[PDB]
């Protein structure tokens, strides 16, 4: 059998609790229930009984992972041969410099390099290596850099932020210790003031919320920093950014369904700290702000029932006047955000369930011209595109940087003249291991949800599999938050498709693939069960159209997708033969009732809050841990990370012990706990790829497919 943890009685309370904050309107008298595995939680990650139990699990795992070591190996190499070990990124102008990233063949971390404006990017005499992450990571289990921020005009000072355990709290430091300043306990973002005199950062809080924006002045003890903005509302996080012209700073608050912004003038120097309210928060209203020069505010917003968004134009001096509408609201178009430059703006968004991008110019009047809206043309019918804003460093620019991809076409970055239309390639990704696009094809089916709704499916397969009989398939899902799983290129799936499998993305509600409403009405709060039923629907479609049979079908999810997996295995475990759930959000009731767990209060406006009558029962009906029962489940691998500040390590830990406890089948439930990494990791190395390989190994093992088609 497998490890089963011991039951220690602990009551967990739902509703009102004196001294704690369980939301605006919690249940009274409260409700109670027993969680016999509560103990598995240690906030300090140090309990001997717990760490011991995790060893049992590590033993079990290793003991059971012996006979895929060799396939995971054949597959790591495929990965490597698909990755391009020595590489340069797509170099961009930032001031008097071209900036770019570099990888070297033996080495696990990027280099951050620089070449002067009019020279040629590449390892050489001109190239200054700004940061070497390998020298940072020297004899350390874990190493992630949040930000590499040089200081405007000069780029003499460069600051960076680093997390050494993955709980995602950062220190900020400077390259080669040119100065001695240190900033502790930040979210990672560094934003600069003028002339390297100071910069802006964001501290965490109770339960790791981003609740404060501060100024740091060079030459000073952090203890002397000035906090500019707190938001005390547990539903919110604070953000911070710089205006195009860099004369204006942008402070905001973002809950899931509500926004607020302020402005600070950087032209008045380090001792000027007074903010300028933009539009006072109004529940239900979300909006984002972008400056044009010092006066004109270009606001993207959902106000007045404009769900997919509308972009408005107003003045700094009368910032609540939003009667001027630049781009009006469209039912079939979602606008996800704007970027604003001296001579135009990019809108990023959606139409027909694919990423789209438009550009908007000034008129002869020097004011933004509705009539100049251009939708940007791409070649493939099913593709993915975003503007790369982390590479648009120049306010006066005329070249706009895009990343373009499809499940067939390896990624391209290229510049495009906003006016001319012409597209030069900057970098096209190379894929070795003998890969070629013409070996693959991607089309889109539509599944039918129980309520009639059409759920899109995106799929890719080697052009030479026999489609006149069922095939082994992997069906991947997300879909929470309004986040979309894109049909973009991803080498990671080649090991499956290279062995005659069909890789497939279910576009379930909760996602935002089909517009904002695919998320807000379709899959959230009291309509969150669609996420799971839409998924189940996609999978039945795959079976009855004859693409697959459940003995040949697998599924994969991560994070909130782990939630999707766990619910779906609770309901229709018969549909799968094998299943992957990385860092899976699965102990929903228990976590969601408790304000102290790092992301709970944000997400009272996502799933709901089970301290409330309105939400208790509903969430209960899909909470994976709470719905584990005596029945067959398929082979399952769970991957967790000890310092995961997003999904707590104990969550999958319980779910794994409970599955083994109740499950009546005898398939394997393995649980891989990297005690060195967090949420995203597995790792920040070649070890990421090693981790990923076992996952594919485990599946392919269970599917009984090992053999390439070439």
């Amino acid at each position: 059998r497998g490890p089963i943890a011991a039951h220690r009685p602990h009551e967990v309370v739902f509703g009102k609790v004196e001294g704690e904050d369980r939301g605006a309107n919690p249940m009274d008298p409260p409700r109670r229930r027993v969680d016999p595995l509560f103990w598995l939680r240690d906030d300090n990650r140090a309990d001997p009984e717990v760490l011991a139990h995790l060893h049992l699990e590590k033993d079990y795992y290793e003991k059971r992972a012996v006979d895929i070591k060799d396939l995971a190996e054949t597959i790591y190499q495929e990965h490597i041969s698909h990755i391009e070990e020595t590489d340069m990124s797509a170099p961009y102008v930032y001031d008097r410099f071209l900036y770019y990233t570099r990888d070297v063949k033996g080495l696990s971390y990027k280099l951050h390099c620089r070449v002067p404006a009019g020279k040629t990017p590449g390892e050489g005499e001109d190239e200054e290596i700004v940061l070497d992450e390998n020298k940072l990571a020297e004899g350390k289990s874990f190493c992630v850099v949040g930000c590499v921020a040089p200081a405007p005009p000069e780029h003499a000072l460069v600051a960076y932020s680093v997390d050494y355990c993955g709980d995602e709290v950062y220190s900020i430091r400077f390259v080669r210790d040119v100065v001695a300043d240190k900033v502790e306990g930040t979210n990672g973002s560094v934003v600069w003031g003028p002339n390297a005199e100071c910069f802006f950062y964001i501290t965490k809080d109770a339960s790791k919320r981003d609740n404060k924006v501060w100024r740091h002045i060079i030459g000073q003890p952090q203890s002397e920093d000035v906090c500019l903005y707190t938001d005390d509302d547990p539903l919110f996080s604070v953000g911070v950014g710089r205006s195009g012209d860099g004369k204006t700073l942008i402070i905001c608050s973002m809950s899931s369904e509500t926004s607020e912004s302020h402005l600070l003038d950087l032209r008045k120097g380090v001792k000027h700290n007074t903010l300028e309210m933009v539009r006072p928060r109004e529940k239900g209203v979300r909006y984002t702000v972008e400056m044009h020069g010092t006066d004109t505010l270009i606001v993207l917003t959902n106000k007045d029932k404009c769900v997919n968004g509308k972009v408005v134009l107003t003045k700094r001096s009368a910032p609540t006047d939003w009667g001027t509408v630049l781009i009006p609201h469209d039912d079939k178009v979602t606008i996800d955000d704007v970027a604003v430059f001296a001579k135009f703006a990019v809108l990023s968004g959606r139409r027909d369930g694919l990423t789209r991008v438009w550009t908007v110019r000034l008129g002869p009047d020097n004011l933004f011209s509705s009539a100049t809206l251009k939708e940007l043309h791409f070649d493939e019918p099913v593709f993915t595109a975003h503007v790369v804003c982390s590479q648009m460093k120049t306010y006066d620019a005329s070249l706009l940087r895009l990343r373009y991809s499809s499940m067939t076409t390896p990624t391209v970055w290229y510049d495009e003249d906003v006016l001319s239309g012409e597209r030069k390639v900057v970098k096209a990704r190379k894929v070795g291991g003998g890969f070629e696009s013409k070996n693959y094809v991607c089309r889109r089916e539509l599944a039918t949800a129980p309520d009639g709704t059409k759920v899109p499916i995106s799929l890719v397969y080697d052009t030479s599999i026999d489609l006149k009989k069922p095939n082994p398939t992997m069906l991947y899902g997300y879909g929470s938050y309004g986040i979309c799983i894109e049909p973009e290129f991803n080498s990671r799936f080649l090991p499956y498709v290279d062995r005659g499998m069909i890789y497939a993305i279910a576009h379930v509600r909760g996602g935002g693939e089909m517009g904002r409403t695919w998320y807000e009405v379709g899959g959230k709060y009291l309509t969150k069960r669609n996420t799971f039923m839409d998924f189940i629907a996609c999978a039945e479609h795959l079976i009855s159209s004859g693409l697959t049979t459940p003995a040949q079908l697998s599924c994969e999810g991560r994070s909130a997708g782990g939630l999707l997996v766990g619910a779906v295995l609770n309901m229709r475990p018969d549909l799968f033969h094998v299943a992957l759930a990385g860092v899976p959000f699965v102990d929903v009731m228990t976590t969601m009732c408790d304000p102290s767990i790092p992301l709970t209060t944000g997400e009272w406006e996502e799933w709901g809050n089970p301290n409330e009558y309105k939400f208790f029962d509903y969430m209960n009906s899909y909470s994976p841990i709470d719905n584990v029962r005596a029945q067959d489940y398929p082979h399952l691998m769970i991957q967790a990370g000890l310092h995961d500040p997003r999904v707590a390590y104990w969550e999958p830990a319980k779910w794994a012990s409970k599955l083994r406890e109740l499950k009546t089948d005898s398939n394997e439930v393995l649980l891989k706990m990297d005690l060195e990494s967090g949420h995203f990791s597995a790792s920040d190395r070649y070890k990421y790829l090693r981790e990923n390989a076992i996952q594919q190994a485990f599946v392919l093992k269970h599917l009984n497919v090992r053999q390439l088609l070439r």
């Binding site: 981003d210 929470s480 999904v647």
Partner: peptide, 4 residues
């Protein structure tokens, strides 16, 4: 930036 900050999610499940």
């Amino acid at each position: 930036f900050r999610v499940r």
